[PDB]
Symmetry: C3
Subunit: 227 residues, 3 copies
């Protein structure tokens, strides 16, 4: 099987036959319970978009672990110049890796890479649909509500990670609509509570989304579930 | 109560408990009836995307009024470096300000910021759904027809500003389709006639859109309506 | 009438009253049967997005032929600084040229322009809907599956070029879903086989898409069809 750990914000660690981390915003993440040294051996890094609180410590983690970063073409070009190993994809594209299948999904957001003083173009933002041993995980990344999420309903997602913080992403209300579009077996709220600007009523989300027949698992940073 | 004035092209002004201007392309706008001096006290500035005919005089207006620019993260970064006060958001995110709620809506467009001879990355383009005193205003920004507009149907928008100029945006035919998808109480056409390249038959738009059951108010630049 | 020639990868040549080429990745394209010299007189060049394997030889072809490049505002700005004639548009915008109508369609992808070692921002990616003498050609460009494709169903497209290579774009299974959304009279697969990373079972695509009631025409690079 596999162990899926939420480490705060948009961060998600997947431990199976290979170890995969999504949007590794670790150092500088005020709600992340672990340091970089607290992570296990990392094989793959998934980056949804270029923003600092998602790209995060991908360069350091990749180099330390000899890990491969999976992201869009533009983000992978940026990382390639830093001496990071990459497997470039793009939106709606999928590839079968040794551990399983990764598919980039559409998102409505931005993908600017802040490099010192300059905003570098990091392609278009995404989510990830990950298929491991028949099980399906959806990490929406940063996104607003979008009708492209309806395309995921036929996938029969087991666990969906959705942002609920609002302002930069979907709020509670729109996240509930997203859950109804996607119809995952379980939903985990994320990308909230990190700062005051993205405070969200997570208990209200659980209540509202479970009224729509979708099980909601509120994971505190550090907590995990099994698939 | 509030007064909503179309200044022609993409330009819009909302006067209520606070004054809000959307896409302030004033100086250099051949169809704009006012100078910068003609504008009242501005509290907030909304920028849909980075193109010059929408970004416009955001910097000058912001500084002279001590106003806050509301836009996406990448645009707010660019403006921040020029000494402008900002409230960063992104696509599908909303925030409750003192005057009311602003929500960024997805749009199909570009968002290049022309600085000198360089094309700076300005995130992804957007529209704005503005909720003030129970009234809803939709400013589509620059956009082509998109299925995301159907998400606004349940909002029961009071006034929708849609581009009809074509070429850079929806033409008359697609704007009619957008109006039917959104089904607002009123539609106001915009972003046409400024140059010959974006000539549109605005009277034909009114006829066609009203045949589909959506009232069209053709506002000349300078003309307003009351909410 | 007109002759439509697939020249491998995303490349498509349309020969009629005027000569139009889409995404002219000629030199450095190992599956393209022709050299640049092998192209006829080119009147217009269509560029879906900034990636090198689509932008291709647009600059050189344009200069040699005194041709006009049709692409989004940001791409046309880049090309403009290299002394290329351009007609700028954007997503969902259309314009009536002497040969016929061109409309930019939404795509879910990126649009980075690689200039030396810098990733220049090239707007948002697109497809093209081209109307010539009542005939409609859809070139999807690089894209994942998107609900925006359903907007094209009412057009009754005659020929639709869809990528099936996977990884960077739709794979076989998603391209079939796209074909069903669009319901063209004919579908031609493309953007596969060029490298090992984008290998695709083109015969399986034909079989599966024709089961859904859409005729599939497999064109090897160099082959053509009449409209
Ligand atoms: Ni974020
Ligand atoms: Ni973000
Ligand atoms: Ni514009
Ligand atoms: Ni624009
Ligand atoms: Ni490509
Ligand atoms: Ni591409």
């Amino acid at each position: 099987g596999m162990k899926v750990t939420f480490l705060g914000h948009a961060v998600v660690l997947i431990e199976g036959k290979k170890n995969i981390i999504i949007d590794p915003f670790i150092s500088g993440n005020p709600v992340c319970p672990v340091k970089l040294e607290g992570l296990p051996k990392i094989d793959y890094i998934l980056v949804t978009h270029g923003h600092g609180d998602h790209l995060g410590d991908a360069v350091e983690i990749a180099k330390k672990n000899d890990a491969t970063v999976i992201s869009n073409y533009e983000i992978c070009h940026y990382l390639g110049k830093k001496g990071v190993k990459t497997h470039a994809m793009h939106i709606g594209g999928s590839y079968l890796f040794d551990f399983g299948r990764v598919k980039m999904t559409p998102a409505v957001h931005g993908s600017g890479i802040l490099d010192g003083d300059s905003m570098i173009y990091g392609g278009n933002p995404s989510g990830f649909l990950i298929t491991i041993e028949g099980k399906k995980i959806y990490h929406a990344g940063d996104t607003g509500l979008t009708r492209e999420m309806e395309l995921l309903a036929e996938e029969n997602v087991d666990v969906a990670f959705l942002p609920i913080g609002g302002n930069f992403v979907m709020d509670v209300e729109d996240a509930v609509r997203a859950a109804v579009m996607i119809k995952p077996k379980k939903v985990v709220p994320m990308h909230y509570g990190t700062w005051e600007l993205i405070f969200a009523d997570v208990e209200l989300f659980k209540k509202k989304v479970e009224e729509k027949g979708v099980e909601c698992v509120i994971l505190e940073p550090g907590e995990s579930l099994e698939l």
